[PDB]
């Protein structure tokens, strides 16, 4: 994982297509420009989207499918000073370094590249793709492993069905998903989409995406308010909808959350939807004036010892109140009384 010091990494959302303009020859200590350029790609499929004529500078171009090697460690990559090398969305540890610089243009930031250098090309005003499910439209399925085929449809059409062969390893599925998600975030309007895979695998993919975005943020990428939603949270949202939400809105999750955003501030308390949407890691909110949310907390933290609970925590008081309510209501059981103890400060 300890990245070699010759690697330069550029990360951007718009790298789903090959960035021909950015590829340039490198010079070794020999101070001679090297024109024999060699490129690597994940699978043979990507070879069909690399023009040999988009590199006027370079004399000769050779393409290969990046197939993982075992005889060479990443600590000491093999050096071939006779040809420049440029990687594209690599999914396994890099093992071959060309003369001088060696750029790696990728849309995914795994662990293998984390400790390398970085130049993130962040993005402005991303669109959030809309996830839904059919249970009335002309579903337009898309070959996830080769999204570049259906670029025009993705630009134009609205509904889309993520589809994966069973051959694809987890990493390639992740890469294709990230490609399509970047395509959406660049789209002019939000696009609807679904996945034809078992739910557990979808959760694994979304965990992978969340950690990828975490690494991107830890390297200084601009935050994106667009993100996936946990399936359990989805079930909670569906229950809330069935309770009161009649239709199926496009961004019904955002609808709930904003419908309670309207009330977060004036009553000074968290809407329970947010609480259930989330041990510890307790969430809060702010106003321009100094005040917390959950207890109306001060900007420091939960106070250690503010006032005694003598009149409440004593078993006598709780028992008396329990007996009073039980006698008044006619119950025999099923009623629990708890002292008001979660009183940080009024």
């Amino acid at each position: 994982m300890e990245c070699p010091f010759q690697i330069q990494v550029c990360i951007s959302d718009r790298f789903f297509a090959f960035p021909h303009n950015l590829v340039e020859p490198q010079s070794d200590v020999g101070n001679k420009l090297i024109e024999n350029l060699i490129v690597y790609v994940p699978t043979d499929d990507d070879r069909l989207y690399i023009d040999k004529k988009q590199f006027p500078k370079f004399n000769s171009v050779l393409v290969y499918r990046h197939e993982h090697d075992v005889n060479i460690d990443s600590r000491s990559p093999k050096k071939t000073a006779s040809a420049t090398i440029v990687y594209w969305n690599p999914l396994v540890p890099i093992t071959e370094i060309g003369a001088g610089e060696t750029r790696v243009f990728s849309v995914l930031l795994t662990n293998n590249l984390f400790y390398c250098n970085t130049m993130i090309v962040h993005h402005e005003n991303p669109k959030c793709p809309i996830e839904f499910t059919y249970p009335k439209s002309n579903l337009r399925p898309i070959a996830c492993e080769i999204p570049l085929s259906h670029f025009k449809e993705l630009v134009e059409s609205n509904d889309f069905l993520l589809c994966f062969n069973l051959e694809t390893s987890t990493m390639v599925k992740i890469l294709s998903l990230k490609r399509i998600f970047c395509i959406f975030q660049y789209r002019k309007q939000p696009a609807r989409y679904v996945i034809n895979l078992p739910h557990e695998e979808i959760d694994n993919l979304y965990n992978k995406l969340n950690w990828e975005r975490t690494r991107r943020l830890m390297k200084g990428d601009v935050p994106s308010n667009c993100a996936t939603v946990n399936r359990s949270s989805l079930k909670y949202i569906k229950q809330a909808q069935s309770l009161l939400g009649i239709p199926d809105y496009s961004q019904t999750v955002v609808d709930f959350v904003k419908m309670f955003q309207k009330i977060i501030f004036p009553y000074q308390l968290v809407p329970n939807v947010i609480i259930k949407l989330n041990l510890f890691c307790k969430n809060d909110s702010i106003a321009i004036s100094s005040s917390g949310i959950v207890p109306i907390n001060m900007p420091d933290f939960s106070p250690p010892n503010t006032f005694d609970y003598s009149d409440y925590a004593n078993r006598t008081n709780i028992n008396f109140v329990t007996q009073r309510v039980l006698t008044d209501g006619g119950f025999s059981s099923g009623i629990t009384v708890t002292p008001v103890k979660y009183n940080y400060y009024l």
Partner: protein, 32 residues
Amino acid sequence: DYEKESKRRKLEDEDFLKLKALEFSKDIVNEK
């Protein structure tokens, strides 16, 4: 004197150009 705004606007316009240049992949003639 300032910064950011130039970079942000350039990035946004380049993003629009990229989404348009996707459609550039259509060809007009074959040679083989």
